[model samples]
Target: ESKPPYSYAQLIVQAISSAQDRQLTLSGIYAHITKHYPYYRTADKGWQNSIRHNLSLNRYFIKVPRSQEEPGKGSFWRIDPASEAKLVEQAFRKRRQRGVS
Candidate 1:
C-alpha cells in the first residue's frame, strides 16, 4: 500500500484531471497524491523529488505561467490532451494484455 501501482505520469494525469481547471501547482500534485494514495504519506522525500524530475523532463506535461490572480509559489502543471489520451489508451491496453495472458 506504500507504493502505487501506476507510474508517476499516470498518477499526475489523474490528479490534474480531477482538478477544476485540469491543472495544479506542484504542491497541489503532492497533496493529491498523498490524499489519494496513502503510500506517499509515509514514503520518502525522494518520491516527491522524483515527481519534480518527471515534470521537468516529460513532454506530456506542460507548465502554465502563474497569473497574478493565482497565489502559488510554482507554476501550474497540466497534461496535454493528446498525451492524456495516449496514456489512457496505454493503460487500457496493458490491462487487456494482462487479462489475455
Candidate 2:
C-alpha cells in the first residue's frame, strides 16, 4: 500500500500536468514526485536516475531550453501538447498492473 501505483512515465506526466506552467525542471519533477509519492523517500537513489532515463527515452515529453528570464541551471520539460490527452489516458490505464523495485 505504500508504494506508488504509477510508472515513471505516468509520474512524470502527472508531475508536469500538475504544474501551473505545465512544465518543470528535472529536479522539479523529482521534488513533485517525492513530495506527492512517499514511496520515493526511502527507495534507492536509483529511482531518481530512472526518472531521468524515462524523460529522455520518452518522446512524448520535450526538453525546452531554460530562458534567460527564468535563470535556472537545468532545462525545462513539458509534455507534447499534441499527445497530452492520450498520454494522460494511457497513464490512468496502466496503474498497478505491474510492480517496480
Candidate 3:
C-alpha cells in the first residue's frame, strides 16, 4: 500500500490545466488522471468522486454548456486560471502548514 503526490484536488487542477488542447470533458479529465495516476481502478478508488465534488464545489472548473446539436454528452471542463490559482494558493498554503521546510 502506497500513496502519491498531490491531493485529489491538486491533481484535478493540474490535470485540467495540462489538458489545454480541445474541449475537456469529464471522460477526458478522468483519462488524464488515470494517465498520471494509473492505479485508480483498484489501488486508488473514489478518486472520481473527488473529481466530481471538486468540479461542482470549486469555481475554477468551468462547465461549458454544449448546444443541443449533441445529446447525452457531458459538459466540458476548462480552467478559469485566476480562480484556479487562488484555489491552489490556498490549498498549497494549507499543505505548507505541515511544515514547508
* TM-scores of the candidates in the order shown: 0.69, 0.73, 0.58
Stretches off by above 4 angstroms in model 3 are 1-4, 39-41, 66-75, 84-101
- By TM-score, the best candidate is 2
Worst 10 residues of 2 by lDDT: 66-75
Which candidate has the top score in lDDT? 2
Q: Would you list the rank order by TM-score, best first? A: 2, 1, 3
lDDT of 2: 0.71
lDDT of each: 0.68, 0.71, 0.59
Local error of candidate 1 at residue 13 (angstroms)? 0.3
Regions of model 2 farther than 4 Å from truth: 1-4, 65-74, 98-101
Candidate 3 residue lDDT tens string, 1-101: 22435565666666666666433677666787467656554545555666666667666676676665643344566666466666556434334345567
lDDT for each residue of candidate 1 in 1-101, tens digit (9 for 90 to 100): 24654576777777776666577777777888688767678874666776777777776777776556653444667777677777655433322335557
Clashes of each: 0, 0, 0
**Candidate 1 lDDT (Cα, whole model)?**
0.68
Superposed on all Cα atoms, the candidates' RMSDs to the truth, in angstroms, are 4.4, 5.1, 4.9
Where is the poorest 10-residue window by lDDT in model 1? 89-98
